[PDB]
């Protein structure tokens, strides 16, 4: 079930524009509003890309709310300040950013919870 959805993926360091908003529920209602959109794209979480995002690191999980095995890399929106979790874990496959234009190298596809 749920929704299947795809992103480009774009390098930290052509993404100028990392933030979608500087608060966690913000940039985490944008994120789901560019992801509407479809202006919306990923960055790969490494080692030294915190420091260089703003702060809102709106984050995807592989979906914390199951226990079975067999099925795609599902994901769910999610967002911290520090990083405090999720960011310093290994669930977790990305940051989102909003796509303008920084040329992708790479699309993740994940699937997207729709309760109905």
């Not at 990305?94 to 699309?107: D, K, Q, R």
């Amino acid at each position: 079930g749920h929704v299947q959805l795809s992103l480009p993926v774009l390098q930290v360091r052509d993404v100028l524009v990392r933030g979608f908003g500087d608060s966690v529920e913000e940039a985490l209602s944008e994120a789901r509003e560019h992801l509407k959109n479809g202006t919306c794209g990923l960055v790969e979480l490494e080692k030294g890309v915190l420091p260089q995002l703003e702060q809102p690191y709106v984050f995807i999980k592989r979906s914390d709310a199951l226990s079975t095995n067999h099925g795609h890399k599902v994901v769910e929106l999610v967002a911290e300040m520090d990083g405090i979790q999720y960011g310093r874990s290994g669930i977790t496959l990305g940051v989102l950013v909003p796509h303008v234009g920084e040329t992708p190298i790479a699309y993740r596809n994940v699937l997207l919870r729709k309760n109905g």
